[PDB]
Amino acid sequence: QISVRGLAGVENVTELKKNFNRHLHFTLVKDRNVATPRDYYFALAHTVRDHLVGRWIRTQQHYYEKDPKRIYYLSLEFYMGRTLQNTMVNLALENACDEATYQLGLDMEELEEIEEDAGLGNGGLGRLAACFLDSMATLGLAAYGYGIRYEFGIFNQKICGGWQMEEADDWLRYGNPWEKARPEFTLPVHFYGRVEHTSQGAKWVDTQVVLAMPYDTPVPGYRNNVVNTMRLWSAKAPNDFNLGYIQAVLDRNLAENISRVLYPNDNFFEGKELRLKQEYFVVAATLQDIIRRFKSSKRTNFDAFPDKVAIQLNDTHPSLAIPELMRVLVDLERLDWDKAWEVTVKTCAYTNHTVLPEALERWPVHLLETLLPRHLQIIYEINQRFLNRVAAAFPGDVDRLRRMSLVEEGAVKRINMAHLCIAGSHAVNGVARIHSEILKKTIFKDFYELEPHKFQNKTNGITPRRWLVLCNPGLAEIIAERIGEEYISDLDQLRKLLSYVDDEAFIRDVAKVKQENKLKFAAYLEREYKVHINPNSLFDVQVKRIHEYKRQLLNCLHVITLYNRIKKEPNKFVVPRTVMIGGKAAPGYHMAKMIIKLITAIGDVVNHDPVVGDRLRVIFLENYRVSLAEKVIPAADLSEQISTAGTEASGTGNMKFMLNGALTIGTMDGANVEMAEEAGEENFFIFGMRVEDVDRLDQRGYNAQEYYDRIPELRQIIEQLSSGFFSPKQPDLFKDIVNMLMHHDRFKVFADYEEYVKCQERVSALYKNPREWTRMVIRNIATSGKFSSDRTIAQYAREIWGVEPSRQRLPA
Amino acid sequence: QISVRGLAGVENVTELKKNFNRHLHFTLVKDRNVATPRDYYFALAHTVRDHLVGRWIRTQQHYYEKDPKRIYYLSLEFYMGRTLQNTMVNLALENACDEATYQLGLDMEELEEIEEDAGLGNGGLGRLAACFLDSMATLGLAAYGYGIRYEFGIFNQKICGGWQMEEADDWLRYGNPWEKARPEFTLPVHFYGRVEHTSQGAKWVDTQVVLAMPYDTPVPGYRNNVVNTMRLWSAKAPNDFNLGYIQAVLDRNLAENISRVLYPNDNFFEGKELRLKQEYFVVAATLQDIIRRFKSSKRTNFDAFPDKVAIQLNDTHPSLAIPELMRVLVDLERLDWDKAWEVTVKTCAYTNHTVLPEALERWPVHLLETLLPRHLQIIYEINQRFLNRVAAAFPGDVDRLRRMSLVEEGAVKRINMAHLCIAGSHAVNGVARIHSEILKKTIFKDFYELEPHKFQNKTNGITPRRWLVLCNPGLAEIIAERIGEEYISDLDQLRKLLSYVDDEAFIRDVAKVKQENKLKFAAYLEREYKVHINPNSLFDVQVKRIHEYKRQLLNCLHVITLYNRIKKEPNKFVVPRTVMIGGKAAPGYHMAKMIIKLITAIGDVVNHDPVVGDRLRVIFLENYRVSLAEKVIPAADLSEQISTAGTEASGTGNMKFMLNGALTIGTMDGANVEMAEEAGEENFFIFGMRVEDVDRLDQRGYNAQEYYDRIPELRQIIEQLSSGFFSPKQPDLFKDIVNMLMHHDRFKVFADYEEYVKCQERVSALYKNPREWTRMVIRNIATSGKFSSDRTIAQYAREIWGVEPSRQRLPA
């Protein structure tokens, strides 16, 4: 049908149909008379998987023969979404499978909807890991993603009576055709116990043992025949575990609970023992596997270890890799401390994802003492040696010594895991230019002064395979018609589109693709949720995890302003909008749960007011996840990126909207700054305080009452919330929200309100002129190239890992 | 190589090799360079499984079209063992696969050893269910086995310091290629709650829900292209289960624990709540599935239900089927009580497996009250109506009323599940002629008097596929050479062998096959256990679960007698023996654990005494299970079947030894009586008290001291045990054993000692004359035909289920 989806050759289609029928019969044990759409999905998945196998085997054979430096990406989260379409895209099989299934009397898009998301992450950090795996394979790097195979991923969100309810994400119920269990590579992991000192060093004894069983999932590169591996560990009890008899067998669950469930917190640290066990479990199994592969490659020369191994730490979650590597090298391999430390530093690098104090991992010493006694001792020794260096560099500066210590003093002694990561890594990076600068100026200032060479920036990116070709084939096609297909793995080529900004045909085509996407999404909503929207309205979208810093509340204030203005002048023309907000709240985060209730409560009033009509709709998008992002992002006109300046490290949702033809309303925060720089400030809707303005306000003290007193429209909204206008049956329902905004608002919602509302007026003004709206859109798409994760990964490769990317094809 | 293993045609072999390589590549994702023997096993298993699929699909299609009466065999145990070789035998693929793997450079027998036993049973009762499934498929019956998919089967037994240790049987660790998950047929099961009475009958409300997910395993018939189904249920929590958040997800384990582990008790009732949950879980899911299939076949006519459905209860474990069927028919389908009861009685039949009082299920009322409140009410109503019938038949007989009641009075009120099964079944059977007679004379006398027509006998049997063709191909072949292959599904044809009892060639061939089997087994022991035996000795074998009634202790007394006699006259000739005892003890059964220690302790003394040499060896066979039975039984010369008369209902191990060329030393107990009747008493080594003799001794009182006083050789053994001869470091180790034998022996070990020892002398006498030993063996094999489970199943089919067996082939 469309060019970018590849060839549908007679031979290919014939073979696909044949193998589909083989799998339905032999694999699924069904015939066409009893088969359901789910059976058909699985028959297709197995058929496509078969095409990965040969390439997967020979890629791994190639790495053994060539013996390149290996890259190990350690993460507690891999937010993968669905795999079927992504695999077809990367293998150039989409059109062929579409034809084959069509000839069998099946709709492929209907089959695609059956696959469960692999929802093994919370949001930005987890999705970054997924985009990174795609780019590393596309760039021919010998890379492995290592994580945990959670039996339950991020919860499914149901909205009941306007409230979030959580349901278990039982994603493995029907099986996972993509993974391959590798019980033969099972490894032991140790917990608890005690440390014994012998004539020949320390020994960690009397431990409890949990087995780590790996499951491997293929990661295909874009049309280069490279297939890399994501290896996820599952927890298993040993067979003599607890071994009255019945209870001992039932108690195996205690060991296996380690890999049971993903902690559903986003940008928030919870110091629970089970989470610490998860962090060590992934680190211990992964490091053993790395060392095994290093020894088996081509007495043991660990001096060359950093030449053949790079370990990237995604946040501090796998920070225990640092003392674990020291433990293995010193206690087991018998290297001297100084040599082991040199190897460790040159091997490890650390990526920071936030500056919010509540997100920083600070583990109580008493927890580490009980669970990991040898690691605590190693951490104390690292700290002593590090502080000896600080004292030599800054003699007499006693406060610097306490500020920089890995051990924090107080009520409970804690270990600062970020301090550990900086000390034990050769590179530390932030994830956008402004964020990386904030790190050097504020929270890691002391460390930057000691070791300036360690600090880098690597601006985040997204993969243009999932986030353009897959989710928006209509846009991919009209671009390819003009500039060819090379841009899919070289996104900077989108700049060529600048020469079409005055092209009347292109303008019409860009706008046509957006309309079609909006129609399709408007239909999706009616079918699956019985919600009814006007597809001719401006689609105003804010999708991301619910958090006070992201300021969904500022969006709510604007929505109520628009409603109040309509009620004041009902017969005045306004540009129609559909305001869509979606995202999950952490189950324990009360204020985020209250914000969801507020959004639905506003919808309850606005959507049923006869005077409003179809001029304003407010919709909460339930169960926001990767597969939903792929649907809504291509349909969006306006992307809301409105975090308080200095709080969103980078953002990546922002980049997805830019690539897909939405304009951005945003603060100068995270990557928004670089996006505006690339496109031109005149092609962005920037408003509000800059970081420096927030700093000034903090200095004199933020007083929300001042804004309430001086802005009549703001006062009206607060009075409506307080008096029960949006909750008639429970007048005081939103008291906590009002109290927070008036007395305890860390994120200064009122301070950006006036400029936000005015900027929104400018958006509505431009939308009234379709031609100029679309020309600005083209200027955004054309300059989105920098935000490909291929660019990001090439920078990590050259500046941190010391490896060269390759666009060269492996033989098919 | 050998005829009975089928053809190895060029086309077949070529295709098998091709598919083996396909599975290694696509299914296992390996090449020949990295593959292990386990990978090769799996590639073969998938290749063989592929051959089952077409036949499995069309068998189930055939039953839908023909709509025959369906047979449902309900059991908490299916002791299946390994599946690979059994499947090859039944499909006639053994020689072809042997050739194909040979050409690939692999040894098939080595690959077969990799498969884990499906050890989903304890012993005789569970293995009977497995043999029954094989026979039902071979006889073309539309039969389904229904049970629980335990994640952990019967524990693996390790012997440490002479003691039993238990390890978890993690049989699913590497996957199970034979099963197919069917999550689409998942069904809810209800627990707890309360009963509400409405205008329209009772309602069971406020329940907890557990999901039952089925897994289907194919059951191939012998070369008839029939493939039946064994459907095993797995427990799953619903997704809103318990739905702070983390704990709610972790607590799912509580629901899923229902299918976690097999209770390891053999002939012993333990009244634990979890076991009751297992029993209802299998019954509730199974009955819903049966009713669904009945409604979907060809408003709803339940009068015809018993014409299309038979439910066989394997012991009382699934007895809740009776009140569950009443519940569904009365509460849900709204039938009147009397009609529902008629349907229930005509549908259900019950098989009793023991008369030992400690094995009988008597559930406390308080347990049923809390867990299954509606079932308790239904049971009370069944009891009231049943007792009203008894009162009408036997007016004034008040003690009969209390004896026959389903409710037992006392300290704790209990429900007698055997009484429930008799009341609610149209047929009740024992499992050997003597057992069935004991039921009518003793424990069920009252019930027999009320309803004599209900009581039947169905003597147990074993499948000649697993228990001859599979485990003893050498014997199968020499038989086939003379009488053809038809006997494999018509075992009565073995009678033709009586005309070869004087055939010098046949005599030599029978003895040659035994020697080879013994050599192979003697080698297996050295390889896997480093134990060294003389293959020219008489192989004296007792393998079965460890229990006081089975009298492994009587065997021990004989062994010590032989040792003492040798020590008394060292230079006298004795027929050399290897005495082998194996079997598992229930983890909580102290006396059985002590018996295992005694056996190893005797071995410790006997096997290291230089004066004994290789004339006497005592070996404990570790981890006795189905796969081990297949190895040892063909190697045995003497089969020990020495339970106290009246205690072993039938036995089936006895039949396996008879078929495989061992002679039997035994009491007139269970099926031993019918075996001796078939072969002729002169061709059996019968000794000891008959049932009537045990009864007489009980009347005057059993006094063990009398035997100790009158038998000097017995006195010597007891003094050796007491004084610490067999435990020098712990002199009083066996005090409990001596005390039991002297003061509290329910099974009268001393009373059979003299006759047992004398009978053993007659065995040794015959073994000295190889030719006459072998002629007696031929007379046993030739008359083993009655003990085929094909005969047993044909009797169930005609006399209980009302269906006709068929040897007719389905199209391939």
Ligand SMILES: O=c1[nH]c(=O)n([C@@H]2O[C@H](CO)[C@@H](O)[C@H](F)[C@H]2O)cc1F
């Ligand atoms: O716990 C966190 N969970 C999360 O999604 N993040 C996010 O990481 C993304 C990838 O770098 C960035 O784009 C965002 F700015 C950041 O908020 C940060 C966290 F600390």
Ligand SMILES: O=c1[nH]c(=O)n([C@@H]2O[C@H](CO)[C@@H](O)[C@H](F)[C@H]2O)cc1F
């Ligand atoms: O719990 C029991 N577990 C068991 O193996 N059985 C056995 O059942 C076999 C099959 O009928 C018979 O051959 C045996 F006589 C009997 O002991 C009886 C039980 F009650």
